[PDB]
């Protein structure tokens, strides 16, 4: 019978509430409210990285914090220098509407993925010298949303099918299905040990998912709308989330509930980019109202705006080192801001 | 030492991305869209994963991405197809059942933030099988408003009344809120479409040069 | 969490009224448009009704108008729909949709099959 498994869904959901009702003794904001705030940030663009032809929805920055890769919808794979403005490599992909895009920590290859239902993974250090494709991985049903190597071995991905998956690279299937998120997975990330990783999907819900077992630990609620962003704090055991309903959300996966939100009345457009700095007092987020926000993390004051850009930013990521941050939108530039 | 390779391995990238600048800008993307029993893979196939589409109608290459490779949920991919330069829009005029989901359907592109820009070509298809059902299922059942309506086909004039009325609705929602959309009658067996295309098209972005040298 | 629970369902005689509360818990009434969608038994999911955030800009299917109608209150953060007149067409469940974003007019997916700010829906039977 389906009314008595309803019934023992929503009692479990009222067990779960009731446990986060009562865990929740005090807040983050209020146990920070003795510690000095952070000031204003005012970052800079000390470089601008121009040649995309179309708009850009993804970067990954590379772990040595001096290349990037970004893809945008022309069908194009740019790996930068940003040290030096140069273009390391143009990879022209198969298919033109590419959404997402990765950067190996070795540095050996890359990813993309979008509308073709494929991670397509390239080979920077290629014998010859040319980029050629590496890895062609199918088996998804919708769109890739976020793809996010683990090393060069393996790769999790996240489609628009409502499932993640951890695939093998050498044998170009998956090798773990994750299931259970009810909307479009639109963003993944993967933890500084790599044993877990959340993702945040269309159903304003963020799983956090073990990359062996590839059940769902953990199940964060609290969103109003679609979470087209997420990532982790630094030290693993927390996470923040961007959504469309103009809030921001760090959870932390210890309390399984939510810790702090990130809104202001002036602000009623979503959030398409999330990420932390190196010590994770500062959490970046782009937004639809052309800009984005450096939020206090412990504070929730809108600490900083970068407003370099004249469109849609939709992608925004933070150096290994902390150095810099890359906010690309949809003006086919990626801004690096410090 | 190793700036000097970088920097000519970075000038041959941009003069083969000046390359891929002028391919992609001759060019002209297009976004097809319509229900599952539309007939928009006749549409598709008519001049010739996504399914795409290379035509050349005068010497203009149009390239037609057809997706049906997805779910039924589309508020995220569809915020991918904003630079394109038009919407083609598929609706079965014959199909009064779902001819209100492709109203909504409309609506909700028309409506989309990132799609505000994007002028919607509008392709009423089955308007063969729309005149057998208006000779031979009432319209009126699904659409109090045609018992108000009045004509603003050749045989018979309550086709023409049907086929205009579905325009009128899909062009009530077009003006209720840039971009223009252009309805068209057409059926399966038609070779015109990739004309309609190149000329609606062509006041796209005639509109849109227009826009950008001032003169609107 | 974002939930919706529709109440107010069950047999009902041809030409009579029904009302259908949904109580919304998990987000902000006042700046979702909120949708009252449909699925007959063997058939699709059909969209019934839309109202704004304001409650000023209300619309209905074309086999319901007349009979039919949508309202919201923000102040006790529900929805109804009010059945009047009811074919033996109507018989259906009913499900409360949800704006997928905040302060848009455009309401994307509304009508699908694995839809996420939707009820669990009501049985309205002739």
């Known amino acids: 019978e389906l009314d008595q498994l309803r019934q023992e869904a929503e009692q479990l959901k009222n067990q779960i509430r009731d446990a986060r009702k009562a865990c929740a003794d005090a807040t983050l904001s209020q146990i920070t409210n003795n510690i000095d705030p952070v000031g204003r940030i005012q970052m800079r663009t000390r470089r601008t990285l121009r040649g995309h032809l179309a708009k850009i929805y993804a970067m990954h920055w590379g772990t040595d914090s001096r290349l990037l890769v970004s893809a945008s919808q022309d069908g194009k794979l740019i790996i930068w220098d940003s040290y030096t403005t140069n273009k390391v490599h143009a990879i022209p992909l198969r298919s033109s509407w590419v959404m997402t895009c990765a950067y190996a920590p070795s540095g050996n290859y890359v990813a993309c993925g979008g509308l073709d239902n494929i991670c397509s993974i390239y080979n920077l250090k290629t014998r010859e010298g040319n980029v050629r494709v590496s890895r062609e991985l199918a088996g998804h049903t919708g769109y890739l949303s976020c793809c996010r190597f683990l090393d060069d071995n393996q790769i999790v991905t996240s489609s628009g099918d409502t499932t993640c998956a951890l695939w093998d690279i050498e044998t170009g299937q998956q090798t773990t299905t994750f299931t259970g998120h009810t909307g479009d997975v639109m963003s993944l990330s993967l933890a500084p040990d790599t044993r877990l990783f959340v993702s945040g999907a269309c159903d304003a819900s963020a799983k956090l998912w073990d990359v062996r077992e590839g059940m769902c630990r953990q199940t964060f609620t609290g969103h109003e709308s679609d979470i087209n962003a997420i990532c982790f704090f630094p030290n693993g055991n927390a996470f923040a989330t961007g959504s469309d309903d103009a809030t921001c959300r760090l959870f932390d996966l210890r309390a399984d509930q939510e810790l702090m939100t990130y809104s202001h009345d002036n602000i009623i457009c979503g959030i398409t980019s999330v990420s932390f700095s190196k010590s994770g007092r500062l959490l970046l987020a782009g937004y639809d109202d052309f800009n984005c926000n450096v939020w206090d993390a412990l504070k929730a004051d809108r600490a900083g705006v970068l407003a370099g850009h004249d469109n849609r930013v939709s992608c925004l990521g933070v150096t290994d080192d902390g150095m810099a941050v890359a906010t690309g939108s949809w003006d086919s530039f990626l801004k690096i801001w410090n | 030492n190793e700036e000097k390779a970088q920097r000519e391995a970075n000038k041959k990238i941009e003069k083969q991305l000046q390359k891929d600048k002028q391919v992609y800008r001759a060019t002209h993307r297009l976004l097809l869209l319509g229900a599952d029993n539309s007939g928009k893979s006749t549409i598709v196939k008519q001049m010739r994963g996504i399914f795409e589409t290379k035509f050349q109608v005068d010497k203009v290459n149009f390239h037609m991405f057809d997706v049906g490779g997805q779910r039924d949920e589309r508020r995220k991919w569809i915020q991918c197809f904003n630079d394109v330069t038009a919407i083609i829009f598929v609706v079965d005029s014959s199909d009064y059942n779902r001819l209100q989901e492709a109203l909504n359907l409309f609506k909700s592109i028309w409506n989309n933030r990132w799609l505000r820009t994007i002028s919607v070509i509008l392709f009423l298809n089955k308007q063969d099988l729309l005149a057998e059902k208006v000779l031979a299922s009432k319209i009126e059942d699904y659409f109090p408003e045609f018992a108000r309506y009045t004509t603003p086909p050749g045989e018979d004039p309550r086709v023409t009344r049907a086929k205009y009325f579905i325009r009128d609705e899909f062009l009530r929602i077009s003006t209720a809120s840039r971009h223009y959309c252009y309805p068209h009658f057409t059926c399966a067996v038609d070779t015109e479409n990739a004309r309609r295309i190149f000329n609606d098209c062509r006041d796209i972005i005639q509109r849109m040069h227009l826009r950008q040298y001032e003169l609107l | 969490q974002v939930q919706l629970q529709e109440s107010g369902g069950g047999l009902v005689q041809p030409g009579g009224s029904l009302r259908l509360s949904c109580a919304a818990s998990?987000?902000?009434?006042?700046?979702?448009?909120m949708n009252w969608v449909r699925q007959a038994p063997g058939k699709g999911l059909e969209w019934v009704s839309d109202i704004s955030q304001s409650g000023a800009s209300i619309s209905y299917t074309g086999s319901v108008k007349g009979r039919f109608t949508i309202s919201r209150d923000n102040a006790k953060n529900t929805l109804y729909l009010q059945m009047n007149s009811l074919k033996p067409e109507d018989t259906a469940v009913y499900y409360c949709?949800?704006?997928?974003?905040?302060?848009?007019?455009?309401?994307?997916?509304?009508?699908?099959?694995?839809?996420?700010?939707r009820g669990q829906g009501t049985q309205v039977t002739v």
């Open positions: 949709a949800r704006c997928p974003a905040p302060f848009t007019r455009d309401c994307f997916d509304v009508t699908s099959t694995t839809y996420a700010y």
């Open positions: 998990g987000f902000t009434f006042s700046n979702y448009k």
